[model samples]
Target: LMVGGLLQAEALQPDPAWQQGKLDNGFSWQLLATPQRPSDRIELRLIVNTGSLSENTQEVGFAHLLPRLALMSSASFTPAQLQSLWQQGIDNERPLPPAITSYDFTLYSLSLPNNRPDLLKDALAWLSDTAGNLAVSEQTVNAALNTATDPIATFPQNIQEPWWRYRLKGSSLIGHDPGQPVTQPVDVEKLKQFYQQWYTPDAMTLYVVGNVDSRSIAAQISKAFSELKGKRTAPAAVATLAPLPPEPVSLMNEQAAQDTLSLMWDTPWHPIQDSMALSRYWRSDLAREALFWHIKQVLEKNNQKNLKLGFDCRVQYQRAQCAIHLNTPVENLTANMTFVARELAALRANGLSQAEFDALMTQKNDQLSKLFATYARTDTDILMSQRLRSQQSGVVDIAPEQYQKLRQAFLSGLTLAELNRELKQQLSQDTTLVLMQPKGEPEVNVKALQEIYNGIMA
Candidate 1:
């Protein structure tokens, strides 16, 4: 794990024994391995990717609950049953989940391999049993619901739901979408049903990355997972999200942040089928970046106001929706909000510099070129990424020579004029601005917000 500049990983992939496997019942599996020296320690995991945004409008956050419910009390383990098992950890053996990405929540056990063959089997059994019959106590469910208040949730004013700004600007599953809002976002009833819907063979990716024999581990995995019953649960198909507002809506949070403002903009249509979809992803990415760096440069020469690198932003692409995400915390969130809006709207007024557009092209090409250098990241994990880079997301899988050509094309063919075109095409004036600060801060008057809106809209 030596990161010289950025990611100087001599070995990138999981490890040698990190094998792919499946059960007779159609569970997909793959193992990811890491540094576990002389000890025969292994991390046993079960991960299913169906998560939050899939929550029916009313069942907003049930995805987070699924993991809690699954682990709380299984058929074999009740609340007391789990605590008793935990007291066993008073010694020195333990297994736990570190993090869950947007797609799946990971439940794992870390222990000596030889001593815990049954542990893996048992863990799998617990998962399958719980998957079939969850034993979550009402008390436990009520308690775990506020996990966001812990630490990670409050950090950065809950950027975890930045994706939601888009959803709110447009549409996604929610109490509002289908009309029948589930109880709480993480209601027990809705959670159980959502689990049954997406936690099926058709929706999961069984990945196991680690050391050891691939085939043998695959067999063990099959033996453990074969008992799962129930049919494949396909996620419900979704329709295109409606067009976002033509103007930014500045929502006031009851609590206040230090001082901040955010903006959501509509970008070009994003589809999976484009051979150059990754290119487009990066292209729009470059535009946002160009705006970002330009803003950074703008802040540099100016006196040190509230301008920090707080310009956290991204060009997010959903299957059918696209958004230009922006966040900033200036001395005055209200003033900064107006400043950003004016700057963006003026994109049509003054137009952009040729130098700025060139930077955009360069950034786009540079990022795309990295698709190959990610090669030396060898061992096992990197190679797997290489294979899938092409198989899955239409990653060009360009050779060095071809890469040079593509880079040249983006740099020369897509220059200032083209960027101005894309910028106009991609920029969305109708934006949504959300800011959350500490509970007590100067509140923006409705008149202030209206003035801000009228200024941008005009």
Candidate 2:
């Protein structure tokens, strides 16, 4: 609930070295220095922060290729050497894969050990040196190309996202596909161009999280990055996103995917920047949280009682947008959709009973208490929350005070009328719903969906 906003610590180490500098070659840096921990596997992250969103019409997957190239063997590291390094965890891993819809690129690395510290350092040294210094040989290019082309060659995977709801999304965390055909052929020049654009420190952050101390990490980083040059003299400004499409677009993939319905709506981000959303964060959030608990409650019941039928519902509202998604067997899609909609409407119309709201609070409190008390396996939520908080704008900045305030704000924001109003307004819109059924699943006629939309609208 907005009422309990996050109060994260500003620093993991009170005195982290954050610096901005430009090299003679124009590369800039967003660098942080912290003492390394012995247990903290010396990790390295090279994020080509710019993703497909950076692509102009002609260059679609440049961002994707950037990681593949960066992570693939550097010119100096032969394929055999690459395998050796990876096999032993002697070097940092690369092109860390995670979904990137509705989020930014966060390519990372973990410097697993090579038996000992000196060797680890040496490996790290080689890894960093090769990371930016590319001789982009045919061998390297071909290797990288394999990574990009293999997925596209498989008809099943390629067809999946481009056909229905996914096509409509145009982009997700990775943002819209660069649109360039992944299987047609590799764009050697564009490949290099993308590497050139983002490989520089100006576009990346080097995080060293583990057993080592800051001084040693900095010294190593200094040695590792000293000679490498950046290509941009000034910080290259990334462009803005266009408004979402009004019509629901569709994509078809031959591969089988679970039946799912996703509805995306735009909301104000910049909670910290605009402060408006943050300040007003109470009524709607309380209702939303309460609604969420209801989903879990009902779904859990079905999960145990109706094991054959799978169901899921979630609302992950970050600063900018709130995306509500539902995945179920095709049979349950419509019923759940309308049923959930009505649940929201009821919540809006007749706020939660005091007991229901209290139950949510109690659950949260109990969860929190259990987390604090049992350090056994690590409370999953707190660990994740802590991880988010530790990053600069991640979890570290969020404090307990902030969360309580947000919680209180939600619990006390307004009379139920306000929630009803927000709900009514939210559901009032002609929502853009994308139905993604598996390839073999019976196809939904567009006109039928159109009518469903009409009925939903009505």
Candidate 3:
């Protein structure tokens, strides 16, 4: 295949062995049989595509609370029976909880030993109850709310909400915090209405993977979930992100332990739909790795231990950020930032030589080859997780063999010119520079910081 003058690799396909389909009632399902696994364990996931982000003003904390209530007491099982079933289905040493709620979805998961088919049946029944038959009594609602008051449970959210608001300024996500506690008295009727609005057949997906018969499992899934009924409500509206700050920005924290600086860049979100899209992502990844390698070498040559540097590109729903992060002592902050700026300027000016490109590609290719060799023996749980991410990201879940071929095709013909071009483009996106320092420390000059970066880039 050829795309835009470059010899493109063949488009990948999902593994043929996996069976996927939708039910008449609108529930979707995918089943994979992993015969290579040593155990007869099966993993099941019932995902509802509504989470804290879907909650309205009155339903502030109810999204998370509903799942907790389901686990404790559902239509078919009481709290004690549910606990006993989990113990029987999972390993005694490391049992997984029944469900977890995140920003966009609530997932109910179970790991069952296939030998206990009865447990599997019960598990499916319990999840079905959670979908539409959760016992949202006043007592149950109060109990779940009490559990949410644990400091340990809310600690991560308390830290994350403020950080997200700081990092993602001018975004709709700033207005809502998933960890915010419910302040009003419990209204059981209102909570039930909230559940009914979101927990619908069309908003659910079922995933089953293990050494099991697809035919049998498909039948079981249909029988268990076909009766679930509700209308799929429209997802909450999110506004497009505002343009990022063109100049440098800074934040001061009284509890700061170290001074930090970040040079960040944003680009429009590009979903991977075909071989070309996947190839573009691989190219960006290679560019990021090469830049990080160069920066690390420079830091090591200067014996700079106080400064810790890192680079990453993360894709969100509407945009992506590729950032250069540096952490150092307050005294070393300006010097380290200056050093990073100079190194970036040097790279932009001269670009990586053929020798450097070859060395990096050789190392990366070797790593990919090793992974391909052991692809057949990859853990079931890891594969399941990858599949889930692919579904969430709207990307093709290509087979490992196909991925290896596509990777080799791209790397074999890769050129220093292409890599250097990509490197320059990576750094030239809509950019922001953020500095975080302790409140007690003298404020680092934001104006001077921007001038220094702008000067180097120029």
How many pairs of residues collide in each model? 32, 57, 0
Give per-residue CA lDDT, model 2, range 111-147, as digits (tens).
5552256545645554565457654556656776666
**Most TM-score-accurate candidate:** 3
Worst 10 residues of 1 by lDDT: 151-160
Question: How well is each residue in 15-97 modelled by candidate 3, as lDDT tens digits?
Answer: 77678988888999998888777474778888888766787788887776777787567777766878777776653334445
Model 3 lDDT at residue 74: 70
TM-score of decoy 3? 0.87
How big is the positional error of residue 171 in model 2, measured in Å on the Cα after superposition? 8.0
- Evaluate all candidate structures by whole-model CA lDDT and list the values in order: 0.49, 0.48, 0.75
Per-residue lDDT tens digits of candidate 1, residues 265-373?
Answer: 5444533333265456556655666666666666576633453445444222333233333344535555555656666776644447977666656666676677445
How much lDDT does candidate 3 score?
0.75
Best by lDDT: 3
Query: What is the overall TM-score of model 1 with all chains considered together?
Result: 0.60
In Å, residue 428's CA in model 3 sits off its true spot by 3.1
